[PDB]
Amino acid sequence: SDRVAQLTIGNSTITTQEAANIVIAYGEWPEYCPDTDATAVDKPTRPDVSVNRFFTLDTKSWAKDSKGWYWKFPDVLTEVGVFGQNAQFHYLYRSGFCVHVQCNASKFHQGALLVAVLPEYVLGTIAGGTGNENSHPPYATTQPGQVGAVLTHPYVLDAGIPLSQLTVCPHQWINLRTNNCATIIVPYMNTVPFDSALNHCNFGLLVIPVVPLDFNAGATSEIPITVTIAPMCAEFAGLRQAVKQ
Amino acid sequence: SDRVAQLTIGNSTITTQEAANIVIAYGEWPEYCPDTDATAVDKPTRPDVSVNRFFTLDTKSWAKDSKGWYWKFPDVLTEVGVFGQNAQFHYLYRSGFCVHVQCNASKFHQGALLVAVLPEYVLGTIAGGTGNENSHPPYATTQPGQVGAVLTHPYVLDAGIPLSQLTVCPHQWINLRTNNCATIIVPYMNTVPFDSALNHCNFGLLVIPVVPLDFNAGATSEIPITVTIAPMCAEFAGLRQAVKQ
Amino acid sequence: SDRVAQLTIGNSTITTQEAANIVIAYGEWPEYCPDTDATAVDKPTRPDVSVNRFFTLDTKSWAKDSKGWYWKFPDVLTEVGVFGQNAQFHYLYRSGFCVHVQCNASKFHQGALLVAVLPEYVLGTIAGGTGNENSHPPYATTQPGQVGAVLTHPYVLDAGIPLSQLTVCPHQWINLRTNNCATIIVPYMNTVPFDSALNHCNFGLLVIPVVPLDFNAGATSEIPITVTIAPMCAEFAGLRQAVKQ
Amino acid sequence: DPIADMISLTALQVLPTAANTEASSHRLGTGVVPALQAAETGASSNASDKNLIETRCVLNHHSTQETAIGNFFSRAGLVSIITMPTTGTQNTDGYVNWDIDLMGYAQLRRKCELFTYMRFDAEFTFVVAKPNGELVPQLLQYMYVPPGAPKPTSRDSFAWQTATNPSVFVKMTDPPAQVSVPFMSPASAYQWFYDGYPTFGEHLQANDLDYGQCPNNMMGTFSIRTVGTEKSPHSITLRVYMRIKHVRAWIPRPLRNQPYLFKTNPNYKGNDIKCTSTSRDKITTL
Amino acid sequence: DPIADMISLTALQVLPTAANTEASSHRLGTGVVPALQAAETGASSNASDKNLIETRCVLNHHSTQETAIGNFFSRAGLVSIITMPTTGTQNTDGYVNWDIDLMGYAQLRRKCELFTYMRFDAEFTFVVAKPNGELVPQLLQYMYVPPGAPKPTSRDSFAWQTATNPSVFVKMTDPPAQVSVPFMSPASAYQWFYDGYPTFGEHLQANDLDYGQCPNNMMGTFSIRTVGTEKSPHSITLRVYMRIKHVRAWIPRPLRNQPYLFKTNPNYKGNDIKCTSTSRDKITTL
Amino acid sequence: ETGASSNASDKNLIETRCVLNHHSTQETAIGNFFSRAGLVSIITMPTTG
Amino acid sequence: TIWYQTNYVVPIGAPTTAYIVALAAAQDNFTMKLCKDTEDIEQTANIQ
Amino acid sequence: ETILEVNNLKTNETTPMQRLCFPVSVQSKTGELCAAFRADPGRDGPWQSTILGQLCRYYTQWSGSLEVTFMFAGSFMATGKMLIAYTPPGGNVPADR
C-alpha cells in the first residue's frame, strides 16, 4: 500500500512492486501558467496526451566503480517524439516532469543510489588542474542530450559544491535491499513564466552511487539503471519554423 | 460588405478587398468527431493553434495556355509545420479545411478560374492511348505533395468525367473582372470517423482556367496563383513513432 | 459618406469627392478667447464673415524631383482681403484655421504628399556648410508670405529635426491612389491669448512629397498642388494706424 | 478561473409536388435587380419566372416522388454473367468462383457512380439456364464465401458442406432464386471512389495496381456448382441481378462521359476522347 | 455534450519560538515503532525526543527571529573595491568604469549562493579615502549607467552631464554616501545560477564563455570620477558595500566548499579538492 | 491617409490568451522624465589668464 | 520579412515600380521603465 | 505612428529622402523576398527613425506589443498581394517564403 504503485499518463503505464513512496518536489504539483503570471500574449498550444506521456531514455550500466551520471531538462527530450517537435517549432516552453529512475537487483546484491533533482545545475571545470586556466564546459557537457553524461568528481558534483548536501534537494534513494525505483514529480521552476527549451535547462537529474554496488562472484553482474520521464502540463508559445539550437 | 473580408485563425490573418462571398461545402462547418460516431478508444490530441492556422504552398504561374492544377488533402501538408509532424506520428487523423486561392490581375486583364473541391478524387490514365493497356497513375501523380500537379486532359479531369459538371461540387469562380480570390470551407468527409493522413486523400482541390487568361502586349504577364490553406478542428489518435508513408 | 465632403464658410464653399476624413488638430475646435484667459482690456472686433472665409493662395507644380514647400500662419494672409487689413490695423490678433490642400491626378499616376502642421516652426541654416558660421535665415525665408518657400533639406525640415517624425503633428497624407486633398482644422496655439500677426507665426504648413510623383510618358505631367485656407474665429484688438511690418 | 482561454444553414423539407407559380405583374423600379447575378459566389441563380416575366397563377400538382433516389435505384439490373461450360477453356470442372464486383456492367455502374458514397441493402435474383436459353432438370448450389472463408477448389470440396456459410440449393427449372443481402461493409457506407492506397509502405510502379482499391468494398466470393460427384453434361449460364433497397447516397459527382475500360479504375481511351455533347457547324445555326 | 473527454500539501505557520517539549513516560508495546525510519522515501526523520526517551516538560521561549533570511542578509558587506591611482598602470585619467558584479568577494557571495533565486532591494554605501586611509578635500561624482546608456570615456565626457542617469556628488571628507536601489531585473528575481546560454546558435568552444551568463543579472555600469577639468593629485580607493533588504529567496542548495576562482562561474582547483570536513586517523578515536 | 494611427490590436490579428498585465505606466509620466537634475552651465573664474 | 504572395501587377500605362511607407508605434499594453540617458545625442564640441 | 527607415542603405546616405520608403515592382519570379528587418525597437536600425525608437532609448527596459502599418503608394490601377511575417526569436532570417 506504499511499496506497490502505478503511474498512468497518456498511452503509457509504469508499474512497480517495490517503491518507497513518491516525492512531490517542494510540495507543489505541476500546473499550466495562470493569466496573472503570464506575459506572452499569444494563445499557447497544449498538446496534452501526445507530449505528456512517459519516455524511456537509454540505459546505463552500474559498475562497482561508477562515478555517477546526470541529465538536463528539457534537453533530454528536445529531440524525441512530438514533445521534441513542439520544443523545436516554438520559441517558448514550460512544463513539469515525472521522473522515474529504475534499478533492480537481487536480495543478495547491495548498494545505494542517490537520485536527486538540482534546479539550475551549472557545471564547472577543474580550471586546468592548477586553477590558473579559466576553461569552460563544452556544449556536449552542459547539454549531453538523451544519452546523459558521467560525473568526473561526484564528491563536488563537478561544480564545487558538496554531494553530502544534495539531499537538501528533492530526492529519493534507491537502496537495493529496500526499493527498486525512485519517483520525483517536479513542477516548473524559473524566474520567468516561459522559456526557451533549447537555451535553458531548468534542472538536472543526478543519479549517484553513494554506496558502491557489490555482490559475490557468480551473481548477475549486469545491473542496469533506466530513466523514464514524462512531461506534465507542457505548454508552448511563439510558433515559427523548427530550430534545433 | 461582401467583397471585403478577413480570415483570422491561429497566428495568421488573410485579407481581401475583392471577394465574392465564402462557400461552406454542403452547408456544414468542420467539427471534432462526436462520441456517437467515434470508434477508436484512445483520447485524441487536439493541438489547436499550432496546426489550425494558415499555410501558404508554392505559387503557380497562370499562362495563356495553362491546363490547370490540382492538389490533394491532407497530402499537401503531411510534411509541413506541426501539422505534418502530428500526421506522421499518429495513425489516425481527421480535420476540415479553409481553402483560400489567390489571384489578382488588373482591370485590363481577363480570364476565369474555376476553383472546386472534389472529394475522393481518383485519377485515371489514358490507358496507353489505344485503351488496351491497363496502366495506373504513379505515386507522384496521385499524391503530388505540396507542389501540386498539372492536368493533362482538363476536359475530363484526367478521370473520364466532364469538367462541365464540376460545379455540382463546392466551388467558386475567380473571374478577374470581379474578384481576386476564392474561399471554400470544407468539412471532414469519409465513410469512417478517422483515417490515415498518409494512405488516403479525402478530397482534391482543382484550379482550372475555363476562360483562358488574356491581356494586351505590354501589360504585366506574370499572373501568379497562390494557394493558402488552414486545417480546422484537426484531431489525431493512435500515437507511435513517426512514419512518412 | 467619408470620401465625399463639403466645407461652407462665409461666402465660399469647397467640395471634394475623394477625401480621407478631416483632422481636428489635437482634438480641439477653434474658439474666441474667453474672459478668464484674456488680458487686454479693449473690446475686440470680430469681423466674422468678411475674414472667416476661404482664401486660395498661389498654386505650386509637383515635379518628379520637388523637395517640398512650406507656408507660415498668419503670414500668408497678412496682405490679403479684409483679413489682411484687420491684421495691419490692429496690434493684437488670434484665430484658428481650416487648411485645405488640393491635388488630383489620374488612376495611373502615383505619389504621396505628407501634409502637416508644425507649430512654432523655427528654421535653421546650414551654418555655412562647415558649421563654423553662425548665419541666420533671411526675412524672406522665415516669412515667405503668400507664395510660400521651398525646402532645401526636407529630410531634416531645414531645422535639424527628422521628417520621419513629423507625423507626431496634426497631419494627413495625399496619396494619389486614395484621395485628392487633405483637410486640417487648427486651433489657436500660443503662450499668450493674443499676439502680433506680423511679428509671430503660430505655425507652419508643410507639404512634402515623401513618395515621389511618377507616371508614364504620355500622361499629363502638370500636376498642381493648391492651398486654400480659412481663418476661424478671427479676433483683433489694439486698433491704430495700419502697419505692414 | 486561472486560465481564461480554456473555456448547418440547411434543413430538410417535404416537397411532394412541384412549386406553384404565383401571378405577377410588371415591376418598374430602381435598386432592385433580380435578373442580375454573380455566378462567382458558387451559388446557382435564385431568379424565378415571376421575376423576369408576367406570370399567371398555376396550381402545380406534379409529383416529385419518382425522382427520389429510392425509385431511381430500386430497379433490378445485371451485375454479372457467370458461365460454366462443359468443354473448352473455362471451368469444365463443374464449379466456378466469382469475386464479387458490381462494376462489370455499364448501365448499373454509371448510375451508382453518380454518388461518392452509398449505403444500402440489396435483393439478388439468380436467373439460370443453358447458353441457348433452354432449361433442363439440373440441381445447382450457390454459396456465399465471405472474406477469410475457404473457397471451394473442386466440385467436391469440403467447403460445400456449408455448415456456416449461407447456401442456396435450387433447380434450373425452378423460378429464379432470390435473397436479401444486408449492408456488409466494415465502414459506414460503400464508396465507388477511394483516392488512396490500401496499405502503408513505398508505392513503386510495380504495385501501382493498389491505387484506388479499398478492402471496405471487397465483399468476398460467390461460389456455384452442380450438385453431384459426377460431371454434368449441361452448359450453364448464370445471370445475376441486383436490386438496391433502403438506400442512402452522399456527395453527387459528374457523370461518366467516356466509355468504361476496366472494373477497378476510371481509365479512359486517350486517343479517342468523346465530347459530352454532339457537334454542329456554326454556333449561329441549328 | 457531444465530446465527453473535453471537460500543495504545505502551508505557512508563524513559529516565534522553538517547540516545547512535552513530558513523556515509558512506552512498551508492539505495532508502533517511531524509532524506525525509511530514509529512501526522501523524507527526514519525524522522530522526536519524547519518542526515544523519557522527557520532562520544557517551556521553550527561545526566539527563531534571528534566523529569518531577512536578518541573515540585511548586514552590509563588501562587494567591490574601485581604485583610481594617479601614476602607474591603472586609470590615471581621473575616472573609472566598473561593470556591476557582486561575485568578486567570497563572504557575501557564499551567503547568496545558498539560494538559487533571490529578489530584493539594496542599500549601497560608498566609503572613500586615500590608499592609506587618509582623507582630503576632494569632490567626487558617482554615476549609475544603465545598460544601453553611453559610458563616459574621459573625465570630461558629455555623459557626466547626467541629465537622466542618477548621479551622486559628494566630498571625500563627507560621511559615506548612501542610497537605496530597487529590484531592477527584467525577470522576477535575480539568479546566481543559470544553467544555459544567453543566445541561440551553435556553441563552439570559441564561445563557451557564454555558458552561465544571464543578461537578467547584468545591471550595467557604475562610473566614478573626480569633478574637474584638471587631473587630481590624489589617489582614491572606493569601497562599495551592499545591504540586502525586503528579500525573498527560493530553492536552497549545497554551500560552496571549494575556494572561489572566478566571478562568472563555479570552477574549482582540480588538483587540490578540499574535503568538506577535517580528518583524523581512525574512525574509532577522536 | 486619414492622419490616424492604426486601431488594430493583438486580438484582431491573432488568437490571444488572457494576460492580466500589472505593468506600471508611472515612470513615463513627464514628471519623472524631467525631474532629474542635469548640468545646464559651467561658470569658471580663473586667477590668471 | 515581407514577401510577394502573388505579384505586383499593373496594366499598360502605369509605373512598374511603386513604393511602400512603413509606420510604426506601440500598442496599449506597452510600457517602459528604468530611466536612462540616450546614446542618440552627443556633445562632440562646445555649443556657442 | 512615425515613419520607419526600412530602406536604410549605405548608398542612400547622400540622398536621405529615399530611406523613408522601400520599393515593390513587377517580379518575373515567384515568392521573392521584398525586404527584411529586426523588430527590436531600441536597436540600431530602421526603428531609430521613429519617435517610438528615440523615446524608448531614454529607458533601459520595455514591454508590450508593437504595431507596423504599411501604406501602399502605387497607382490606383496596380494590384498585388504581399505576405508580411514576424518570426519570434530563434530562427535567422527565413530562407524562403
Ligand SMILES: CCO/N=C/c1ccc(OCC[C@@H](C)CCN2CCN(c3ccncc3)C2=O)cc1
Ligand atoms: C446464398 C448465396 O446468396 N448470396 C448472394 C450474395 C450476393 C451479393 C453479396 O454481396 C454483394 C455485395 C454488393 C451488395 C456490394 C459490392 N460492392 C460494394 C462496393 N463495391 C465496389 C466495387 C468496385 N469498386 C468500388 C466499390 C462493390 O462491388 C453476397 C452474397
Ligand SMILES: CCO/N=C/c1ccc(OCC[C@@H](C)CCN2CCN(c3ccncc3)C2=O)cc1
Ligand atoms: C547614483 C549612483 O548610485 N547607484 C548605485 C548603484 C548600485 C548598484 C546598482 O545595481 C546593483 C545591482 C545589484 C543589486 C545586483 C547585481 N546582480 C544581480 C545578480 N548578479 C549576478 C552576478 C553574477 N552572476 C549571477 C548574478 C548580480 O551581480 C546600481 C546602482
Ligand SMILES: [Cl-]
Ligand atoms: Cl456435397
Ligand SMILES: [Cl-]
Ligand atoms: Cl562636467
